[PDB]
Design a protein around this ligand. Sequence first.
Ligand SMILES: C[C@@H]1CCCN1CCOc1ccc([C@@H]2c3ccc(O)cc3CC3(CC3)N2C(=O)c2ccccc2)cc1
Ligand SMILES: C[C@@H]1CCCN1CCOc1ccc([C@@H]2c3ccc(O)cc3CC3(CC3)N2C(=O)c2ccccc2)cc1
Lengths: 219, 230
Amino acid sequence: LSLTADQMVSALLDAEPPILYSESEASMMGLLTNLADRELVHMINWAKRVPGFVDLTLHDQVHLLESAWLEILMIGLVWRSMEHPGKLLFAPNLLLDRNQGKSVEGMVEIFDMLLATSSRFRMMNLQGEEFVCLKSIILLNSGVYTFKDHIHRVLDKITDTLIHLMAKAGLTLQQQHQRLAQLLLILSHIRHMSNKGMEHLYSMVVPSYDLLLEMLDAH
Amino acid sequence: SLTADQMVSALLDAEPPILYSEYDPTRPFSEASMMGLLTNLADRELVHMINWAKRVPGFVDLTLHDQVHLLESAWLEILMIGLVWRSMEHPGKLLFAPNLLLDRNQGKSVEGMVEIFDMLLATSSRFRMMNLQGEEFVCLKSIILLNSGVYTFTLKSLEEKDHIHRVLDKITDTLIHLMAKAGLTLQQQHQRLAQLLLILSHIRHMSNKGMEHLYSMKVVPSYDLLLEML
Ligand SMILES: C[C@@H]1CCCN1CCOc1ccc([C@@H]2c3ccc(O)cc3CC3(CC3)N2C(=O)c2ccccc2)cc1
Ligand SMILES: C[C@@H]1CCCN1CCOc1ccc([C@@H]2c3ccc(O)cc3CC3(CC3)N2C(=O)c2ccccc2)cc1
């Protein structure tokens, strides 16, 4: 928690996970599940480098990941897809349009929510520095109300860093707090998407505690 | 055109009343009748919710279709935050009505009910830990009304989404103003703004899980109902 805002941004940029590649309608769902399964491991490695995360007990680290993992997968998809209007870039070799998501019942409703988030990011010209902060807030915030001071300390630190990023970009104080608010209000829609996404996945899948624990690779 | 103080005044004057459950000293409380009472209460609350929304500055500038879509997306979240607010001064309890005050042991009678009850209690506890102020509450409720449905909506649509973000920006200015007036540094102002807006994610999560629970008993106010009221 002693890092400067610049050191925080640099830490988070450095921790970014790699973009993974993909392995008919039937094959489409299998490719998407296999991709998500392989990304999860890299998400766990990313989480361990979010300043302050590894200060939590392993139990609490797992609970946070249980709560945030689908939200983190979607905000990364939305980020990857931001410069591909009307499409979603699941992988460099798996670019899909909404028309491909019509074969499965209830798939296109989420496809559209994801596209709308990408359009919102495009409208706001979301910067990579702001995205890695938002993704860190999702990790620390999503499970906090379902288990504390340390989590809120880290969250306050990320808030400071987001403000610092905006003042550094020349925003007035008013524009700083309006942009902060706008970014955080997107997190409510990402929670909504994650909830509707879970319902859809169950309509056809949660990582177990032991699985997340093992990937954390305790020492 | 409103100032921050003017925005606070409008939102405070728009606040709906606290409604009651039925009184009958000959009728002891029973858990078999609890869901009927809560449904009756929520249905009455929805009517006042419509007339509150029409007084949230900028809300009636939208088309009726988009007013309905926003209410469709936010109505349960608004009932839930109202419940949480009413319960804030009553640890361990949910104050559905002043004469309908329940603890979690009374929320175990129905499957999946205690989980949502546990979440509502935790949000109430969070409101206390922050010493959430009434002026801040009505701003948060307004943000839910304008924000919940805006990512799920043509040239008219672009104009109304622009309007909605302009009203949301003014409520942000108002929240900050209230925090500066209370004597917080800017660091504390930014940090508190963030803490408040992050609670809205949990309120959305609760709304989703509560929808699932409502459909599990077998629910939504129809478009024509909401339109007629609006
Ligand atoms: C990972 C867990 C652990 C235990 C087993 N689980 C495996 C199943 O969960 C998952 C998780 C995610 C997806 C994909 C996937 C993959 C990669 C990505 O970056 C993002 C996504 C996004 C996502 C929406 C959520 N999705 C879909 O298909 C989808 C997209 C659009 C509309 C409807 C649906 C598939 C399956
Ligand atoms: C309004 C719709 C439109 C068309 C018909 N109505 C349909 C009924 O939907 C409703 C809506 C809300 C509730 C209550 C109710 C009432 C008042 C309140 O202030 C708040 C709440 C909170 C709420 C959780 C959401 N709830 C429950 O019972 C509950 C609480 C705890 C755990 C599990 C369940 C009942 C029924």
